[PDB]
Design a binder for this molecule. Structure first.
Ligand SMILES: *CC[C@H]1/C(=C/c2[nH]c(/C=C3N=C(/C=C4\NC(=O)C(CC)=C4C)C(C)=C\3CCC(=O)O)c(CCC(=O)O)c2C)NC(=O)[C@@H]1C
Ligand SMILES: *[C@@H](C)[C@H]1/C(=C/C2=NC(=C\c3[nH]c(C[C@H]4NC(=O)C(C=C)=C4C)c(C)c3CCC(=O)O)/C(CCC(=O)O)=C2C)NC(=O)[C@@H]1C
Ligand SMILES: *[C@@H](C)[C@H]1/C(=C/C2=NC(=C\c3[nH]c(C[C@H]4NC(=O)C(C=C)=C4C)c(C)c3CCC(=O)O)/C(CCC(=O)O)=C2C)NC(=O)[C@@H]1C
Ligand SMILES: *[C@@H](C)[C@H]1/C(=C/C2=NC(=C\c3[nH]c(C[C@H]4NC(=O)C(C=C)=C4C)c(C)c3CCC(=O)O)/C(CCC(=O)O)=C2C)NC(=O)[C@@H]1C
Ligand SMILES: *[C@@H](C)[C@H]1/C(=C/C2=NC(=C\c3[nH]c(C[C@H]4NC(=O)C(C=C)=C4C)c(C)c3CCC(=O)O)/C(CCC(=O)O)=C2C)NC(=O)[C@@H]1C
Ligand SMILES: *[C@H](C)[C@H]1/C(=C/C2=NC(=C\c3[nH]c(C[C@H]4NC(=O)C(C=C)=C4C)c(C)c3CCC(=O)O)/C(CCC(=O)O)=C2C)NC(=O)[C@@H]1C
Ligand SMILES: *[C@H](C)[C@H]1/C(=C/C2=NC(=C\c3[nH]c(C[C@H]4NC(=O)C(C=C)=C4C)c(C)c3CCC(=O)O)/C(CCC(=O)O)=C2C)NC(=O)[C@@H]1C
Ligand SMILES: *[C@H](C)[C@H]1/C(=C/C2=NC(=C\c3[nH]c(C[C@H]4NC(=O)C(C=C)=C4C)c(C)c3CCC(=O)O)/C(CCC(=O)O)=C2C)NC(=O)[C@@H]1C
Ligand SMILES: *[C@H](C)[C@H]1/C(=C/C2=NC(=C\c3[nH]c(C[C@H]4NC(=O)C(C=C)=C4C)c(C)c3CCC(=O)O)/C(CCC(=O)O)=C2C)NC(=O)[C@@H]1C
Ligand SMILES: *[C@H](C)[C@H]1/C(=C/C2=NC(=C\c3[nH]c(C[C@H]4NC(=O)C(C=C)=C4C)c(C)c3CCC(=O)O)/C(CCC(=O)O)=C2C)NC(=O)[C@@H]1C
Ligand SMILES: C=CC1=C(C)[C@@H](Cc2[nH]c(/C=C3N=C(/C=C4\NC(=O)[C@H](C)[C@H]4CC)C(C)=C\3CCC(=O)O)c(CCC(=O)O)c2C)NC1=O
Ligand SMILES: C=CC1=C(C)[C@@H](Cc2[nH]c(/C=C3N=C(/C=C4\NC(=O)[C@H](C)[C@H]4CC)C(C)=C\3CCC(=O)O)c(CCC(=O)O)c2C)NC1=O
Ligand SMILES: C=CC1=C(C)[C@@H](Cc2[nH]c(/C=C3N=C(/C=C4\NC(=O)[C@H](C)[C@H]4CC)C(C)=C\3CCC(=O)O)c(CCC(=O)O)c2C)NC1=O
Ligand SMILES: C=CC1=C(C)[C@@H](Cc2[nH]c(/C=C3N=C(/C=C4\NC(=O)[C@H](C)[C@H]4CC)C(C)=C\3CCC(=O)O)c(CCC(=O)O)c2C)NC1=O
Lengths: 177, 164, 172, 73, 285, 164, 177, 164
């Protein structure tokens, strides 16, 4: 898998290039905001267990057919496994935010998911809503606008990280559509 | 790609965990040490032709049998490939000074390197005779800072220990 | 008075030079901020009465001798003149924010303010506490979103904080 | 298979082709003899300790209710 | 301009590419300019002398001088023409002794001083460690400087007061917990409620006592004026269900020899906490 | 303030010269010594309300006569001004470890003090007994390090010798 | 006269505050970047004679009416005093660079320099240009971009020290104006 | 005799105060910077006979008109007094390295020099031109260590600004 530094050395290797003083100008800016990136991964894993049950339970209360007899979240065996994979999904996104590169979200998790949810029978139009609610939460925790828990950071701005995590939660929306 | 980041997110994936405080602390050391290797990287990326030619003719100065017939460097086109490979390794060492680990050197330079040079009769000590020339050539405040000299010449004798 | 565009012109007329190509590219960045500067002046002006009064309210909680008989804000004429001065300083700090240059701020407010408070006996260490309380009420009002698009304004709030520190050292 | 691959190519060979990632695990235990069928326990407590773990390993040869799966047969 | 190792290192733009003195020449397009300077002044036949500044001397160019070279192409022509000298032919470093002058390819006379191994070409200095190489093909001689030769006639309109004076912008180092508190004090007190007193701060412990009498933030709240006529009887309850704990059981921990006690008297407001409170928990009512 | 910087600048201003090589050699001593004296200044600035109040009643544990009529610890205001005046002195020692010299203690605490503590009849041996208690309360490995306690106590008995 | 550390002390003394926590980190940064500051003050006082003569000569070459009868730098007594008016101004700027604060430059030099130069009749436009030439010389020796000298340093960036000493020279032009 | 010790003892005497903690800190910088300059002075000691010979030829090379009849370098006897007068300046900077400041230059070499040279009709630019040579033939990792060259250069420019 790759991170933000192994991504610029697979693009320069394609042209048999060295990395200049101008290819480095984004990497010295990557480690300049490096403290702000750790300070935003830690804002998500600290609310991680609450974020999932926040999200799967919203998926049920919008579409109550998921819990009807013969539904997908019917038994306790099946509802427990939906809360597992809503937590596997959020686990891999924070790997991508920590590395700054979707190479681990899109190869260890998403490589094979769309045909797998076809084989089991997971509805897709509801499992977009699970990842869509977790996208609304994770930009509120990063931008510190969650309505029921603030955290304590140094003052500044994290709109760049708030959209990179929005850019990662919809690859998941695209790789099962 | 053996990085600092890819190590702590692979161990955190074999066990099914989230990132934790030991993982974020590891990437903190990827900020202090990063400056002393990102300027060894640009120092080699600007002056790479002068060190590939200085080391390229150090293979042949020690082993002057290499330009005999039947050997590996008998004609100019084999010499043009021999000076190409020393350029191929310095481009990989420049990559390891950027990603922090020994990612690109292992994935692209050493993987499978041992059984090809035996098959194509390449004397592999002539490869390390140029990298060990590049190692003992560096001046301590002239070329780069003293922390770049220990970071650039750490990836050298990792490659020297790999090839021999 | 003269703003930040007129500041570099006056520095260039006294040398008798045309402006450089580098100097035009540095004035394009000052126009590129442009709307973010006008958001700070909008937020500070729109809450101007509440910034002055609630930071006078917090001054008399921590220094309650100013409103005791024999204090410098004890009477109606002496209290109303104290709120009037705190609104004068917030006015010329917003004038210096829309201009990008602290020239109207000292030529029309600050020059002669230390000489005035030394002839009257007004405590200059308590005026600077009232200036520093309008500062962090306004640099906390600057970097909240509240109907602004999301972005980085941390270079323009260091300029607004520097106009409050300038008004505070010209009286202390 | 992701936590014994030496290469980044070998990682990609296991993700895309699932019948290779299966037999890459199985072939490693045959040559580096880490199967049950090659392990002789060197003590009477180890023969209890090895018996204690495969009672759980045989416990997934049955379903959630205790009827027999098709696997262990 | 392709493979430096190709055709060995005997080409003219592959010899200097593989000598590590000046890789700035082929990095920009200064290689193409000095091959057209040597054509315009007919120097292909006569032996001459070049002074090439090394890598490191390109890096210590000034920011206002480098922008004069990025926008006037005649200035970088005249500067590079001043490094080629046709005075004494293909000279070595032992013929630059003494104080004299040299004539460039284009520019005016440029004076030199040479004292032993220390040779100055005027604004620059020859690095003698590498510097006595001569070429037989295209015949000329090369010496290494440590600074660009740049005459005073060409820098009469570079300046540091044009936009090249260095600046670093100051920052403000506030915190999220501090700015979420102070923004409630910008609403009016008919709207903000208890949040109108959110600008006050924590003072030292002696500031709350008898000459100074600073007010805490709890005294602006309605919890400080709670005095109901009703009371709990405490004999209604079963025995065992009324609990009492002290703060200490020690006499000089509850009251010292001085009167400074946290527990007994009027001196329990002299404490380093409790000047401020949390009225941002509930509402603006 | 009397400091290391302001001493060597004033000495080279009265002589009318530039900063010499011996004036830069003194600021290097300000670098190698700043590690110890900023540890003491941070340990003090975090726990100052507990250090002041522990030393404020070490005055009245030695001198119980100060609660007698007419004395300096009669009423509540006079002990509020006494715990203030001790907290003033501990703030100035925190200022002296930061600056690096006896600057803030001289100009703000010591100059004019003999004429005030005699006019207002405050016994100067009781503005000492609180300072001398703190100097012997310090455990050299427990609160700070070894050289941080050398710097902390050396500014503590400068104040004692200036009141005596 | 205050240094850098005693500037945050007179700022803490205005509000009865101890120095610790937030403010000690900006002073620990001063010690960590303190080897650069001594290494940059040495670069200015090593060339302090050539800097002053070249600044008063370059002021004269651009404005040659100053050495006419009626110009301020006419005779030998006036030229030797103008060569010494600038040697003191450079001396106080090198004090403020060593201290890290502009209080020694404002207390001992700039307070009263304006009414010094209006009693003698010194042209303020010409004296600002002589300071401006010294500013370009001070940034060039700090950032090693001097075209006539090549000082030896360790490798690194010192842009913050050059932008610091440039702000000291602009106080000279704002005072006497 | 300006040193680091002499500057703080004379400043403690000017205010009538004892050696404070601001004074012992300046002696600490004399300890750290000592190993730099004390081996530059060891380098100048055993190799002074060749440094002044190299510097002596570097002023008659620049000013060759000194050997004219009627100038300061007519015969061998006036030539011998110039190699002597530059050997004195190399001994006085050997003293400034072991003292720690510009003391021995300010007393015996600089004070009184510009009226001796004006009266005796000696051009100070040629007493300069041999000092600026050994500043220029000094490259920092060969002739000495990296920090000894900073101190050795710092006194040669102090001598140059004094003559010029
Ligand atoms: C809370 C404020 C502190 C304070 C203020 C205070 N100021 C005054 C009186 C005057 N202030 C000025 C200054 C200006 N007047 C202007 O019009 C302008 C705009 C250019 C400025 C800068 C003047 C001229 C006066 C005197 C005239 C008057 O307004 O009555 C007073 C009254 C003093 C008196 O004796 O009446 C106060 C109380 N004093 C404090 O205690 C606060 C710390
Ligand atoms: C955007 C997500 C936030 C916000 C972020 C900022 N954080 C800033 C600084 C910061 N964060 C941390 C903790 C972090 N660093 C680590 O090394 C580790 C663990 C290993 C963590 C969790 C630190 C240490 C810092 C530096 C400041 C300090 O000294 O405490 C920061 C300042 C910019 C910068 O430091 O580059 C910002 C803007 N702030 C916000 O307001 C939003 C909500
Ligand atoms: C307790 C240790 C003493 C005691 C002390 C008292 N000290 C009193 C007043 C006082 N202290 C100072 C010095 C102090 N003020 C400063 O600003 C600074 C430095 C920044 C310092 C060290 C001054 C100037 C004063 C007088 C002004 C004032 O009223 O605060 C004091 C008050 C005297 C009075 O009430 O008349 C007391 C009581 N009392 C004790 O019992 C022991 C001796
Ligand atoms: C002293 C000899 C130093 C040295 C000083 C530097 N001077 C630099 C720039 C500069 N010099 C002058 C004066 C010169 N130009 C003229 O037109 C005339 C005559 C009328 C003279 C004497 C001017 C005007 C400037 C430019 C000031 C500005 O930008 O406004 C300078 C900067 C860069 C560089 O030259 O490397 C330095 C360092 N230079 C030396 O080589 C020795 C050590
Ligand atoms: C640094 C600029 C160059 C370099 C120069 C060379 N110097 C050579 C010989 C040499 N240099 C000196 C003066 C210097 N060395 C000292 O020990 C002292 C005083 C303590 C000084 C000022 C001397 C006395 C000598 C002769 C003795 C010797 O070193 O062999 C030299 C050899 C050729 C020559 O000049 O005879 C060179 C090349 N060397 C370098 O590597 C950098 C680039
Ligand atoms: C929950 C929000 C969904 C939903 C999920 C269900 N998943 C069921 C089985 C299942 N889920 C996964 C996903 C997951 N496991 C992984 O290892 C990875 C990637 C590394 C992912 C994304 C897998 C592989 C499986 C099958 C294997 C197993 O269950 O262990 C499941 C049970 C089906 C059944 O029992 O018949 C459910 C209900 N269903 C929903 O309705 C929402 C949208
Ligand atoms: C020069 C110091 C050597 C030498 C080298 C020769 N290498 C020859 C072929 C060759 N080399 C490699 C490894 C190289 N290619 C890469 O892509 C990378 C890293 C990314 C490296 C290090 C390969 C794969 C090959 C075969 C393909 C090719 O020819 O490019 C070679 C020709 C051998 C032949 O023709 O059979 C030579 C002569 N020879 C020497 O004498 C010294 C030891
Ligand atoms: C910085 C302290 C703020 C913040 C500011 C931003 N505002 C941005 C755009 C913008 N602002 C306005 C309002 C302004 N322009 C006017 O003409 C007037 C009144 C006459 C006012 C008050 C407008 C109209 C615009 C639109 C222009 C545009 O979209 O470019 C802005 C740009 C968004 C971006 O590029 O990301 C920023 C950053 N935003 C913040 O979050 C802080 C709190
Ligand atoms: C008693 C039977 C309850 C109980 C009550 C507590 N209330 C506390 C504070 C508080 N109560 C109110 C509501 C009150 N104020 C009004 O204006 C009106 C109606 C117009 C009502 C009913 C407010 C607004 C507040 C907060 C304001 C303040 O604190 O002064 C309180 C103090 C809690 C604390 O601060 O720790 C208590 C204990 N608590 C009980 O256990 C029983 C159920
Ligand atoms: C060293 C001699 C002994 C030892 C002594 C104890 N000290 C105890 C408490 C204590 N000590 C201090 C002073 C010190 N800590 C600071 O933070 C500062 C200045 C900033 C100083 C000078 C204080 C303030 C305290 C009370 C707070 C606390 O530590 O609990 C102590 C506990 C009993 C007591 O309350 O005094 C002891 C036994 N401790 C040791 O282990 C060695 C043998
Ligand atoms: C019918 C059932 C039903 C739900 C369960 C919720 C589910 C839900 N939560 C959020 C939105 C959110 N959900 C959370 C999650 C949490 N908030 C916290 O403070 C905790 C850490 C964690 C609860 C465990 C967060 C942080 C947001 C963003 C806004 C905020 O709360 O500050 C959203 C999007 C916007 C919104 O409506 O709020 C939805 C649909 N909504 C519903 O209609
Ligand atoms: C990647 C980093 C990197 C480098 C270090 C240089 C490596 C290098 N050094 C020299 C050139 C040199 N290098 C040295 C330095 C020394 N000689 C010694 O014996 C000592 C060990 C050391 C003194 C500290 C010297 C003295 C020369 C000049 C003599 C020569 O050219 O061999 C040259 C040829 C000319 C030149 O380019 O300067 C090159 C390519 N280039 C690079 O790209
Ligand atoms: C011990 C007392 C003392 C001196 C004798 C001088 C000499 C000196 N300069 C530097 C060291 C340095 N000096 C500079 C300064 C510069 N480098 C540049 O590239 C710019 C041209 C210039 C101004 C920005 C830099 C960047 C360092 C590296 C160390 C650091 O960044 O702090 C060091 C530290 C190197 C080391 O640790 O050994 C020393 C001792 N300064 C001192 O403090
Ligand atoms: C201990 C400290 C100490 C010093 C620093 C020197 C300083 C010094 N030098 C000279 C003296 C001199 N300096 C020179 C020098 C020169 N003439 C030339 O041709 C060149 C211009 C230049 C070569 C460097 C000459 C020739 C004399 C002798 C003057 C004379 O003979 O008239 C004299 C006069 C006494 C004498 O030596 O005759 C003194 C005091 N002497 C000291 O005792």
């Amino acid at each position: 898998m790759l991170d933000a530094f192994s991504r610029v050395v697979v693009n320069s290797d394609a042209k048999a290039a060295y990395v200049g003083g101008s290819d480095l100008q984004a990497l010295k800016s990557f480690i300049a905001d490096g403290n702000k990136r750790l300070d935003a991964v830690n804002s998500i894993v600290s609310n991680a267990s609450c974020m999932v049950s926040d999200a799967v339970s919203g998926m049920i209360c919008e579409n109550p057919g998921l819990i009807s007899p013969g539904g997908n979240c019917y038994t306790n065996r099946r509802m427990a496994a939906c809360l597992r994979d809503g937590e596997i999904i959020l686990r891999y996104v924070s790997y991508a935010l920590l590395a700054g590169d979707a190479s681990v979200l899109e190869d260890r998790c998403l490589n094979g998911l769309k045909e797998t949810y076809i084989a089991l029978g997971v509805p897709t139009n509801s499992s977009i809503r699970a990842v869509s609610i977790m996208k609304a939460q994770a930009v509120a925790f990063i931008t510190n606008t969650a309505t029921e828990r603030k955290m304590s950071f140094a003052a500044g701005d994290c709109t760049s990280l708030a959209s990179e995590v929005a850019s990662y939660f919809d690859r998941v929306g695209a790789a099962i559509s | 790609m053996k990085s600092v980041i890819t190590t702590v997110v692979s161990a955190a994936d074999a066990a099914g965990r989230f990132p934790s405080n030991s993982d974020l602390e590891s990437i903190q050391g990827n900020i202090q040490r990063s400056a002393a290797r990102l300027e060894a990287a640009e120092k080699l990326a600007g002056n790479h032709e002068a060190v590939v030619k200085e080391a390229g003719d150090a293979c042949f100065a020690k082993y002057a049998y290499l330009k005999n017939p039947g050997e590996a460097g008998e004609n100019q086109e084999k010499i043009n490939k021999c000076y190409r490979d020393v350029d191929h390794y310095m481009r990989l060492v420049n990559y390891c000074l950027v990603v922090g680990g020994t990612g690109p050197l292992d994935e692209w330079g050493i993987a499978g390197a041992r059984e090809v040079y035996r098959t194509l009769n390449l004397p592999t000590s002539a490869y390390v005779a140029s990298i060990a020339y590049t190692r003992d050539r560096l001046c301590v405040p002239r070329d780069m800072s003293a922390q770049a000299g220990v970071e650039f010449s750490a990836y050298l004798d990792y490659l020297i220990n790999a090839l021999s | 008075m003269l703003d930040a565009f007129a500041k570099v012109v006056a520095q260039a007329d006294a040398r008798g030079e045309f402006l450089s190509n580098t100097q035009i590219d540095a004035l394009s960045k000052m126009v590129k901020e442009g709307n973010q500067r006008l958001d700070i002046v909008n937020k500070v002006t729109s809450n101007a009465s509440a910034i002055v009064t609630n930071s006078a309210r917090a001054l008399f909680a921590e220094q309650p001798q100013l409103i005791q008989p024999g204090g410098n804000a004890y009477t109606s004429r002496r209290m109303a003149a104290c709120l009037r001065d705190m609104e004068i300083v917030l006015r010329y700090v917003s004038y210096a924010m829309i201009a990008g240059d602290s020239s109207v701020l000292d030529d029309r407010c600050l020059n002669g303010l230390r000489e005035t408070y030394q002839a009257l006996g007004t405590p200059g260490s308590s005026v600077a506490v009232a200036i520093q309380k309008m500062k962090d009420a306004s640099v906390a009002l600057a970097n909240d979103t509240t109907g602004t698009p999301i972005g980085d304004c941390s270079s323009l709030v260091a300029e607004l904080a520097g106009y409050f520190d300038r008004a505070a050292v010209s009286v202390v | 298979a992701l936590i014994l691959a030496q290469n980044d190519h070998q990682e990609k060979q296991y993700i895309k082709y699932p019948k290779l990632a299966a037999a890459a695990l199985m072939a490693s235990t045959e040559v580096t003899r880490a199967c049950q069928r090659y392990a002789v326990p060197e003590s009477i407590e180890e023969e209890f300790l090895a018996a204690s773990v495969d009672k759980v390993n045989k416990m997934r040869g049955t379903t959630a209710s205790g009827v027999y799966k098709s696997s262990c047969v | 301009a392709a493979k430096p190792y190709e055709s060995g290192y005997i080409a003219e733009d592959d010899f200097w590419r593989g000598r590590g003195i000046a890789a700035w020449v082929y990095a920009t397009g200064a290689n193409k300019v000095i091959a057209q300077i040597v054509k315009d002044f007919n120097l292909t036949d006569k032996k001459f002398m070049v002074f090439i500044p090394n890598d490191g001397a390109f890096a210590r160019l000034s920011p206002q001088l480098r922008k004069a070279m990025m926008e006037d192409s005649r200035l970088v022509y005249d500067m590079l023409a001043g490094h080629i000298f046709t005075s004494k032919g293909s000279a070595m470093l032992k013929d630059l002794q003494g104080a004299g002058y040299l004539q460039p390819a284009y520019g005016e006379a440029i004076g030199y001083v040479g004292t032993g191994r220390v040779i100055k070409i005027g604004n620059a200095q020859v690095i003698p460690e590498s510097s006595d190489i001569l070429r037989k093909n295209l015949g000329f001689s090369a010496h290494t400087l440590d600074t660009f030769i740049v005459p005073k006639a060409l820098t009469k309109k570079v300046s540091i007061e044009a936009g090249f004076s260095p600046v670093t912008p100051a920052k403000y180092v506030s915190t999220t917990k501090a700015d979420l508190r102070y923004v409630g004090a910008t609403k009016p007190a008919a709207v903000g409620g208890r949040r109108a007193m959110n600008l006050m701060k924590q003072q030292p412990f002696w500031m709350y006592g008898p000459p100074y009498n600073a007010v805490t933030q709890d005294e602006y709240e309605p919890i400080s004026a709670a005095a109901p006529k009703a009371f709990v009887d405490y004999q209604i309850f079963a025995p065992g269900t009324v609990k009492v704990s002290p703060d200490s059981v020690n006499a000089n921990e509850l009251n010292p020899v001085s009167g400074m006690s946290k527990y007994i008297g009027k001196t329990q407001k002299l404490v380093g906490d409790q000047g401020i409170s949390d009225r941002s928990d509930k509402l603006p009512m």
